[PDB]
């Protein structure tokens, strides 16, 4: 029901998230942010069962922050993704399993931009572009058709807008506003929210 | 005991002036089969207290072991204090409730009869720990059949002579024998008085089958 998307280009990772928080038939909040900043150059976007999403992401965020304080250098995006996969997989067979679908986006100076897809079962795959939620089924086909590995940041926003526009046209659920952010050598940058109304 | 195995049928209690009388049959039945036809389901806890149990014999035998040790332990101390019938009843209620809370119940309903300090005590403890004291007590099918006869006589006349109470218990046992499938002819009568607890040997109620000819 909640929507997450990541598009990765030569020097950047563009990530967007739905801004709606809903209980039963009513959307309680329209300003919700599903993006958690693990480090200066890393963002983890989490969609899933209530409570589990905040608890898992905050724990991962605080542990990643501790690494910077203890060692003086931040983790690589690949290391952070592997740390989240290990923690979620360890909890999978545990009495309390977190139902969380996570997308991890980061820029590493040495290895460049990275996007990681993780399912609730805890499978980590590096993907050029990825999406989560029921919205992904409609959106992924557009991305496969219009995605080129050398896509520019301006063209990436054009692709993102097209994917979100389809969701307005075909998705049964109402997802009016989407938060958009980009990660590059300079760092995480907020981009203006895409609001269809 | 999530599932009961060998079980005993109704045990009846009536309070008479100067004591209590409890009567139980001597049969342990595995389902319909009357597997053990000479088992005593009445226990003399102490001089002033006797216990009759309906339900798993194994659980009753276990309680007899635990209750018997507690009484033996008190006798060793020799402090001049002995458990009252009420005290044993309070202990059983706590023990049955504790097992029910653990979800491993003792599958037994017990009638405790005692006479202490010029007073007669009759008490009921259930598997779920429900406990009460009454002039007339019955367990199992005894509640449905024997208790109405016992209560009607007691309500009309509150105080019963020991002889009258035995006569009432024998009439009730005959009624149970006729209408309870799990009932057996042989039964034991236990009476507690100032003198002490006395359990009589196997007793058989006479039966009338005249109605069988009238069926034609």
């Amino acid at each position: 029901m909640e929507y997450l998307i990541g598009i990765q280009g030569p020097d950047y990772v563009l990530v967007a998230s739905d801004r709606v928080a809903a209980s039963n038939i009513v959307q309680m909040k329209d300003d919700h942010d599903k993006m958690f900043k693990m480090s200066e150059k890393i963002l983890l976007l989490c969609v899933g069962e209530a409570g589990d999403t905040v608890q898992f992401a905050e724990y991962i965020q605080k542990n990643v922050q501790l690494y910077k304080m203890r060692n003086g250098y931040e983790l690589s995006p690949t290391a952070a993704a592997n740390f989240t996969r290990r923690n979620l997989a360890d909890c999978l067979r545990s009495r309390t399993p977190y139902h969380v679908n996570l997308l991890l986006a980061g820029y590493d100076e040495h290895e460049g931009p990275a996007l990681y897809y993780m399912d609730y079962l805890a499978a980590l795959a590096k993907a050029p572009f990825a999406a989560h939620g029921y919205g992904a089924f409609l959106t992924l086909s557009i991305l496969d058709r219009y995605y080129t590995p050398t896509i520019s940041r301006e063209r990436a926003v054009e692709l993102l807008r097209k994917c979100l526009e389809e969701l307005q046209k075909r998705f049964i659920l109402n997802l009016p506003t989407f938060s958009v952010r980009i990660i590059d050598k300079n760092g995480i940058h907020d981009l203006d929210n895409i609001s269809f109304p | 005991t999530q599932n009961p195995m060998v079980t005993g049928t109704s045990v009846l209690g009536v309070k008479f002036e100067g004591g209590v009388v409890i009567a139980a049959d001597m049969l342990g039945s595995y389902g319909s089969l009357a597997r053990f036809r000479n088992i005593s389901r009445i226990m003399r806890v102490n001089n002033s207290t006797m216990l009759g149990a309906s339900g798993d014999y194994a659980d009753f035998q276990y309680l007899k072991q635990v209750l018997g040790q507690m009484v033996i332990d008190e006798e060793l101390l020799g402090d001049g204090h002995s458990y009252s019938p009420r005290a044993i009843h309070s202990w059983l209620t706590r023990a049955m409730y504790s097992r029910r809370s653990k979800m491993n119940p003792l599958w037994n309903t017990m009638v405790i009869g005692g006479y202490a300090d010029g007073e007669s005590f009759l008490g009921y403890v259930d598997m779920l720990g429900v406990a009460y004291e009454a002039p007339s007590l019955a367990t199992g099918y005894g509640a449905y059949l024997a208790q109405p006869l016992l209560r009607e006589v007691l309500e009309k006349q509150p105080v019963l002579s020991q002889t009258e109470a035995r006569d009432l218990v024998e009439r009730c046992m005959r009624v149970l024998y006729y209408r309870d499938a799990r009932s057996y002819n042989r039964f034991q009568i236990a009476t507690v008085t100032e003198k002490g607890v006395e359990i009589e040997g196997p007793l058989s109620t006479e039966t009338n089958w005249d109605i069988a000819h009238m069926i034609s």
Partner: protein, 203 residues
């Protein structure tokens, strides 16, 4: 499985069939259901084979330590009480019914039946297992107090024969043991030796 024990003056006679079955297949056609817990104490085992064998082994070890420590021959009641304690404690876990019969200097021949649920009763005659239901009438009518050792051996064999014919689970050979102060004498009855009762003859 039909297991039977009958007390005689100064002794006990224990009898059992020889069939172990998983469903309608006989895994063992010659199984020994009489187990020696001590020199003059034996148990007849009914119910799960694994549960009975495990309980019997544990009691034999415990009774063996008890006898060595007290420097005295063990009591049948003690052996039965050990079986009753294990059976009652794990009643839900174990589907085992056992008849303990033996000779003690103090109380001579004693037969104690511990049914499923861990209850202990001393009985002049005890029968157990699936075939026990078929022979309940025969045992009640035939049993006579004052039966001699030979009469008890005949009584147990005739009863086991009737149960084995009418019960699918019971079958094979009849194993009999007689326990007395002198010792334990064990006999196996098979084929012609097994008592035969005439079948109905109306084609």
């Amino acid at each position: 499985t039909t297991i039977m024990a009958v007390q005689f003056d100064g002794g006990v006679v224990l009898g059992a069939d020889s069939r172990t079955t998983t469903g309608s297949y006989i895994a063992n056609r010659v199984t020994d259901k009489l187990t020696p817990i001590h020199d003059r104490i034996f148990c007849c085992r009914s119910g799960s084979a694994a549960d009975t064998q495990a309980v019997a082994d544990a009691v034999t070890y415990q009774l063996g330590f008890h006898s060595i420590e007290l420097n005295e021959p063990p009591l049948v009641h003690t052996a039965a009480s050990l079986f009753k304690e294990m059976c009652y404690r794990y009643r839900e876990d174990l589907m085992a019914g056992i008849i303990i019969a033996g000779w003690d200097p103090q109380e001579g021949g004693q037969v104690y039946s511990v049914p499923m649920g861990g209850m202990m009763v001393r009985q002049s005659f005890a029968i157990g297992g699936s075939g026990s239901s078929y022979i309940y009438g025969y045992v009640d009518a035939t049993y006579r107090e004052g039966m001699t050792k030979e009469e008890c051996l005949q009584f147990t064999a005739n009863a086991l024969a009737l149960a084995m014919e009418r019960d699918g689970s019971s079958g094979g050979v009849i194993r009999l043991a007689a326990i007395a102060e002198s010792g334990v004498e064990r006999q196996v009855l098979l084929g012609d030796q097994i008592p035969k009762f005439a079948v109905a003859t109306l084609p």
